[PDB]
Ligand binder design. Structure first.
Ligand code: BGC
Ligand code: BGC
Ligand code: BGC
Ligand code: BGC
Ligand code: MG
Ligand code: MG
Ligand code: MG
Ligand code: MG
Ligand code: MN
Ligand code: MN
Ligand code: MN
Ligand code: MN
Lengths: 386, 386, 386, 386
């Protein structure tokens, strides 16, 4: 039952199953994973491919020699499995040099360094087949109000992403960028804290068509926002280039639970949206097997990410396919929602007396929305109780 | 001390000092205010002007006759005081007809009604001198996931705001629009939940130059976001057409405390930003005197809004003017933040070996940001302890 | 399927299905319900009984005459249905007189009034069969720090509940009290904000055995707390006298969605706990049919409360009954958790060298908890995917 | 100005100024501190003393030999400075062995190990002068609902703290225990998540008089609770044995900013309470100099903790001492709050017709609380604007 296959486009970061378990209050509980072993174990679980930070694949400060061997091993692992690399990203957060950010560090030389580090990995990403290069500004932010002039920092961020856009256009690369928003942690407040903020920022960039969002379930939920809604806005904008899936129990530290845990109902409405909107990008899991687990639990947890998506996909598909649900949708006027409000135009609307002077407001007010019955149908389907 | 004057551009909604105290669990504790009395009492407190929902000024369902007398009284009150009306807005939330929204109700006739109601008040707003017409989609949203197709709802919202833009362009009006974001309440999740989401949405509108944001201190804080940061992003985008000021104690129901209460430090960093960025629009207070107060407390609470802004303005101005602070700002490299990261261009950056190959990363990493000393200087100033 | 029967002990407040839909930003969308009609419609849905605030049953300021007719009608409705009244409570929040609280108002005469109002309804509750009298201090609190001396207010609250305890002991009543915690709303912060705070407070009361908690799913979740955990602590303390069930989507205004909505997984772990711990009190639904609904949706929403509990009860029972789950429970050492840590006593523990000097820490550290596999089994069961 | 002296009873954990800056997404930015250097630098800043986890002072797995030298060096540093050690605690969270908790690990041998580790450090704490031994159950909890039977875990926690109580009674030690609550992180939900929960739990212990709370500003605020209120409840209960001070910006990861940052107004109301209630225990700072800082910033940040307390203490003292404030307090009936509600007893209250039958409810309802004017006086004082 619910066995993932490569056509489900499930991908995992190297840093996910590879997470060693060091948290703010704790030492590592698992040994470091050879990226080659992760490629194989993930392929045996049915995954479509893998993603990486530069520093996951090539340890920081590697010689050109050692860099080459690390890439070669990895490429060989991709060969014998067919594993794809749809996305890659830069580690602009771990090293002490980035303690005040990468692209928006107050120190200018750190900003130039960040760009060179990113540009080097773009090349590697493009060679491996990456279609999206993700930017997560984990360190772009502040704990205190005087430490960052946010308008100047937005200048520096626009200038960085404008340079990366100019670079990929000069190389004729096909790769596109996706900003991964996060509201906070490890900075007190992170710039571009939500999907909305990243989407707005992209529109001031020089080549906005090159940039989209990589939203993460848990990150929007850390601001208490509705992740299915934010995704619909990203899709509405045409900017859902990529997506990070995982679990989060409300507003607290970034948990990165396996997808399906955390807000289960939101997970259902999310899968329902991706599937019914025809999202065709990677279903990427940016999660962490809890440090309570050993390696067996790491792989069970990763298997759980895909299984929960597949179960949810089946419940949503049956929900939409149900005639009582289709009848409930009309009863709640979801079909009227898709109708243009005034396709007769402004002037016709201004003269329409049934739109104001003769609008029976109390009759329209007394029409129940029948939202609760529709939602119990969704609940019944989610729980298999139909 | 700290006495507000009209040049401080402090404005209040009729619905603020006029709030009667009915909350979800409680009946009203104060009698309804005559809008004329509010105009006068606010002018006697030093306010610049007032704002209104249509339904604050003209009770719902008024005859053309009674509408005229309500407007005439109001206009006379503005005459004898000089009170301005910089902003007006539509009540698309109180009446039962809007229980599923205005511009994005599933019922199409309610959507057309909402537009006619808005368009009627636009005319009145323009006649009274309003420069901004605010849209707050309080009812645009859902409590459950199946009740609203968010992409279709975004279609309906874009079509509504496109029609309002077409209307004001046809009348040659000067007024501009400002979306007032709110993440939730009274809907479980409200569309365009934050400043970011509203800014992004505006860029898909047909005449984006006509639309900006009216951010509210408390609303961004209900998503746990940094209001001074979101404001800097709005200013960076050129979209801070208007601003709502008040207090909020973290993530919970919309409190609308008087400005200064709630997150005091955020209030300081906010005033510091508006003043140093040269914001020149209204300092509008969308707050509610707590229902524990009588009319004396209503007016003391409103006076508190302006007083706290003025005290904070003086502390921030002294903070910036302090030489130790200017020295602390350089010590934290805030001046380096304003410098272009790579004004020598992409190619020069690619060949700069001091940007990567010869970048001493450990030396840059060991340079402390001196952020804590700068913040204690800000704290010392805020508390008058210098 | 999943049809509730009186033996399921489902109860509803009069104020739940009877909620008219007035919220902070909105007028009522439904007409007021005759309490008699609610008793009948709820009995036809399979409910065990009803609960009430005094002011739900007898309108405020009723003559002794009119009070009598309202009680008589109600008692007749209970007769022809067999509906029980397991719990009643006082409205110490709606009337303007309680704007600063009931038992902890700063005004002493309001405090004495609150007690008389409560004591009058205790009598009525006891006559109707109530076993629990619930106290919700909705108005006990403050928006600002100087407005309430919290230690003095705790004195006044202890003195109130001590008087109610002295009253029920003098009348020889069997009824017991249950404090219903809420962290905020409509006050900025409410005293005894969580289950923990109420449990602690009870231990300083004069007859602690008379007092327990009435925890509400949504209220603990408004503080971001784990409701199943808090319930286990209440059960552990022997104080789960009663329970309020409903849905809440994280930290925001009190939503009071129907049980099952909001945090579905928490709902599952809750039902799993009540059932496996043998809770035998009322399954009380303190929810609100969203104001988008008409009367048909009110009753569908109420039916949804019971249906979701019953579905969840079946999933949890099957989860516990599953041999793979019982094997997973042992694999995660849940059975070792029930074992006394040192039943050999302090001295034996002090001399046990396998407890410290010869404890192989790295071997114990390398034993995975197998928590993820256990949780996917729970997920599989919840979703019917076994 | 505002220079701390030992009589201010300011203490710091070794792990605070000693925090190296490793966070979930980042490597350390500062070198490890010699505990001896920290004792001296803190004494030069005016601190009263220091606190430690066992593993801060003696590195894990130290020989009896090396343990002795580490303790000897430390004791010598305390000698030449006069620095006190008022509190010590056990590290039951860092080592991988504690990944599922200490006292409530599912593995029984880990639970016995935890107790032996705690008991060993109790001895050392008592020898150094510690009056409070703090328990922080950082790892007591779960990420998923099936992983922890919370009632069994409460059994194991009561049995652990009962054994520690039996141990200190057998040795005739004077030291008392203080539970340090935290709602979450690093576990998804931590047992005894708030002050309320810990206070309640203490009352089921065998010798409750030996146990109090060590509340942390930021931890209650991570549940969105009012820290000054929770402290008043702890004081009301007689259980404020100790207190952790720091800053937190709302509901998010545990920030541990320096005291004064985060919720400044709450900091003011906190100092106002500790001082006016006559708290005489340590003012302990459990904070972390942000990893952006070098060693100069570490010490400036620590100096900021004490300075902000001292500034706030002066503002609160002047607030209380102000005659307009004392007049405002009476105007808001804070003096009536301290009066017994019904010292005439139950029967007199039952017969008092001015308490119900002849209570003019509308007159009492129309008396404003004058809370806003009182709060602006507090604000004016806090900002030095009087
Ligand atoms: O940089 C991209 C990735 O970095 C990871 O370390 C973080 O956990 C993710 O939030 C992000 O997707
Ligand atoms: O519609 C504009 C205004 O409506 C008011 O009722 C709400 O309180 C505000 O959020 C908003 O500024
Ligand atoms: O007073 C008891 C009840 O009052 C109701 O109005 C509130 O909604 C509930 O929180 C509470 O259970
Ligand atoms: O164990 C006591 C201390 O441990 C520290 O590591 C944590 O940061 C604190 O929350 C706690 O006060
Ligand atoms: Mg991510
Ligand atoms: Mg507003
Ligand atoms: Mg309730
Ligand atoms: Mg602590
Ligand atoms: Mn994450
Ligand atoms: Mn608001
Ligand atoms: Mn509720
Ligand atoms: Mn902390």
């Amino acid at each position: 039952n619910y066995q993932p296959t490569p056509e489900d486009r499930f991908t995992f970061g190297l840093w996910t199953v590879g997470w060693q378990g060091r948290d703010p209050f704790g030492d590592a509980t698992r040994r470091a994973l050879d990226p080659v072993e992760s490629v194989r174990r993930l392929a045996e679980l049915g995954a479509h491919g893998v993603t990486f930070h530069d520093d996951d694949l090539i340890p920081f400060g590697s010689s050109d020699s050692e860099r080459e061997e690390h890439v070669k091993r990895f490429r060989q692992a991709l060969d014998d499995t067919g594993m794809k690399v749809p996305m890659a990203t830069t580690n602009l957060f771990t090293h002490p040099v980035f303690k005040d950010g990468g692209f928006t560090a107050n120190d200018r030389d750190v900003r130039r360094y960040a760009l060179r580090k990113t540009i080097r990995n773009i090349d590697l990403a493009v060679e491996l087949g990456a279609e999206t290069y993700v930017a997560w500004g984990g360190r772009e932010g502040a704990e205190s109000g005087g430490a960052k002039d946010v308008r100047d920092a937005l200048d520096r961020m626009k200038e960085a992403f404008d340079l990366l856009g100019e670079y990929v256009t000069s190389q004729g690369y096909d790769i596109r960028f996706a900003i991964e928003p996060k509201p906070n942690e490890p900075r007190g407040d992170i710039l571009l804290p939500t999907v909305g903020h990243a989407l707005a920022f992209i529109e001031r960039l020089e080549r906005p068509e090159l940039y989209g969002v990589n939203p993460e379930v848990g990150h929007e939920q850390m601001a208490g926002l509705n992740f299915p809604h934010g995704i619909a806005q990203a899709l509405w904008a045409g900017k859902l280039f990529h997506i990070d899936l995982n679990g989060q129990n409300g507003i607290k530290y970034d948990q990165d639970l396996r997808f399906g845990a955390g807000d289960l109902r939101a997970a259902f409405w999310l899968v329902d949206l991706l599937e019914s909107a025809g999202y065709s990008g990677p279903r990427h899991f940016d999660f962490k097997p809890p440090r309570t687990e050993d390696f067996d639990g790491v792989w069970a947890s990763a298997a759980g990410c895909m299984r929960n998506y597949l179960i949810l996909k089946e419940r949503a598909a049956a929900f939409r396919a149900d005639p009582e649900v289709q009848e409930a949708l009309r009863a709640s006027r979801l079909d009227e929602l898709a109708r243009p409000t005034a396709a007769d135009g402004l002037q016709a609307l201004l003269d329409d007396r049934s739109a104001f002077e003769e609008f029976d407001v109390d009759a329209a007010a007394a029409r129940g929305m029948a939202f609760e019955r529709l939602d119990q149908l969704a609940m019944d389907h989610l729980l298999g109780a139909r």
